[PDB]
C-alpha cells in the first residue's frame, strides 16, 4: 500500500522485462507493474504534501501514472503475441516517464 | 473492493456527471470510477472462475480495463479544463467499453 | 480527400471489416481508415464555417479524430497478432466515435 | 512530401514549441507535427527498403508514428487550455519516441 514500496516493486519488475527469455516473464512483470502504478497515483509525496488534492501539481503527479499505465497497456500487446523483442524496447521508454516524473517531484 | 460494488460506484457516478452543472461535480465522479477501475480488473469473474490468471482469457479480459482507464484519464483533461459540457460527451462514450466487455464476459 | 470522401473510406472499410474473412483483409481495411482519419482532421465541417480554425468546436472537431485514430492503433495490434475476431469486435466500438461526432456536427 | 521533409517538420516546430512564449505558437507548431505524422507512417525507409512490407521491422516503424500522434494528442489537451508550461514538457516527453526510432532504423 505504501508509495516507496509501489516504487521498489516498479523498479524490480523494470529490470526483469530488460533481461526477460520468455514472453510469460515479461507479462508478469507488466501486470505487477500496473498494480503498483494504480496503488501509487493516489497517494501524496513527501515534496507535495502541504500542497491541496486539487493543486496543478498534484494534477500532473496524477497525470505521471495514467501515462505509464497507457505504456504498459501497450507493452503487453507485444509481449502477448510473442514479440519479445519489440516488448522489451517498449519498455526501455517507460523509463522516461520515470526520468520525468522524479525531476520535479522526487 | 468486491468486483459487484466496484461496479455500483461505475454505475453511480456515470449517472451523477450526466446530471451534474459544474466541473468540480465532473472531476470527483471521475476520480471515483477511475479508483474503482483500478480496483476491478485484478478480480476474477464468475464466467471465468475456473481460469488461471495467466491464461488467454483472463488477458482479454484485464484489457477491456486498461482501455476504460486511457478514457478515463482522457476526460479528466477536459472537466479539469473547466470544458463541462465536453467532458460529459467524454463521459458518454464510455458506455461502449462497459457494453463489450458485458457482451463477453458477464 | 475532402470531408465527404473521407468518410466514405472510412464506411465502406468497416464493412469490410465486419465481414472479412482473413487478417489480412482486416489489416489492409485498417490502414484505410487511418489514411483517411489523417486526411479529414484539417478539413471545416459546414456546421462550423463561421468559426475560426482556434475555437472550442474546432479543437473539439480535430479531437474526434485523435480518438478514432488511437483506436485504429489499439485494433491492428490485434490485427497483426493473427486475432481476426478480437480486431472485428475492436472495429464495432469505433461505431461511438463515429456516432459521438456526427451527434454534435453533422 | 517525402521522409525527409518530414523530419524537417518535425525538427523544425519541436525547436518552436521549447522557444515558445504564448500557447498560440505552441498550438499551431503542435498541428503541424500532426499532419507530418500522418504524412510520414506510409512511406518505407532506407535501411528497410530490402525488407517485407509486412515484415516485423515496418510495423515497428509504422507503430512508432502510432505513440508520437497520441503524445501530441496528449499536448494538444494542455496547450489549448492555455497551459503553456506544461504542453511544453509533454512536448520534450516526445523526443524518446524520435530516439527510438532513429536508434534502430535512421
Ligand atoms: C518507472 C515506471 C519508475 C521506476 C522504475 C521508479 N519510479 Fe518513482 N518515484 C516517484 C516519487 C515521487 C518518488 C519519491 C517517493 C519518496 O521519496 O517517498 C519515487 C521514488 C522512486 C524510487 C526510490 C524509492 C526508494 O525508497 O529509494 C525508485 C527506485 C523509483 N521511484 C523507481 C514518482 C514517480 C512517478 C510520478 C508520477 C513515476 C511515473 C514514477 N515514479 C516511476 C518510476
Ligand atoms: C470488463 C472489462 C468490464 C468493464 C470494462 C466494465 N464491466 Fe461492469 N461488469 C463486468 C462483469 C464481469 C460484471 C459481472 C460481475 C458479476 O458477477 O455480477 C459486471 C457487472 C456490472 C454491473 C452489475 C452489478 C451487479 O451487482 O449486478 C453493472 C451495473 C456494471 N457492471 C456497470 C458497468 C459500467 C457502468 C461500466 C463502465 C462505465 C462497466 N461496468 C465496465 C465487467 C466489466
Ligand atoms: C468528427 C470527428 C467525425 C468523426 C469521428 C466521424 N465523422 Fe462521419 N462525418 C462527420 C461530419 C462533420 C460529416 C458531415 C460532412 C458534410 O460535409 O456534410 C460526416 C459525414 C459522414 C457520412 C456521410 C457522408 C455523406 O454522404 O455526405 C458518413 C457515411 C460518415 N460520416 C461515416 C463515418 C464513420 C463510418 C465514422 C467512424 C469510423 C465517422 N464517420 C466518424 C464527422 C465525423
Ligand atoms: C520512426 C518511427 C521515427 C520517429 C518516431 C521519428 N523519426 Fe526522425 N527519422 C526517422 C528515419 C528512418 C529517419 C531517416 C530518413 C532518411 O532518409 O535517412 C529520420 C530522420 C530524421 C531527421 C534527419 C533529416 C535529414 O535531413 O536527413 C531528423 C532531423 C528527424 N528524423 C527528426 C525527428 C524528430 C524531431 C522526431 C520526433 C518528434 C522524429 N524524427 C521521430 C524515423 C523516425
Ligand atoms: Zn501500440
Ligand atoms: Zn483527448
Ligand atoms: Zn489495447
Ligand atoms: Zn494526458
Redesign the interface.
Known amino acids: 500500500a505504501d508509495l516507496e514500496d509501489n516504487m521498489e516493486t516498479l523498479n524490480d519488475n523494470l529490470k526483469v522485462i530488460e533481461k526477460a527469455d520468455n514472453a ?1 516473464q515479461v ?2 512483470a507488466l ?1 505487477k507493474m ?2 503498483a502504478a ?2 501509487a ?2 497517494a501524496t509525496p513527501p515534496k507535495l504534501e502541504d500542497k491541496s488534492p ?1 493543486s ?1 501539481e498534484m ?2 503527479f496524477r ?1 505521471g501514472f ?2 505509464l ?2 505504456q504498459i ?2 507493452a ?3 509481449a ?2 510473442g ?1 519479445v523483442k ?1 516488448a522489451q ?1 517498449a519498455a ?2 517507460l523509463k ?2 520515470c526520468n ?1 516524473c522524479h525531476q520535479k517531484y522526487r
Chains 1, 2, 3, 4 share one sequence.
Open positions: 510469460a507479462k508478469d501486470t500496473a498494480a494504480c496503488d497515483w493516489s486539487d496543478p494534477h500532473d497525470h495514467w501515462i499505465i497507457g497497456h501497450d503487453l500487446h507485444l502477448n503475441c514479440k519489440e524496447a526501455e521508454q522516461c516517464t520525468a
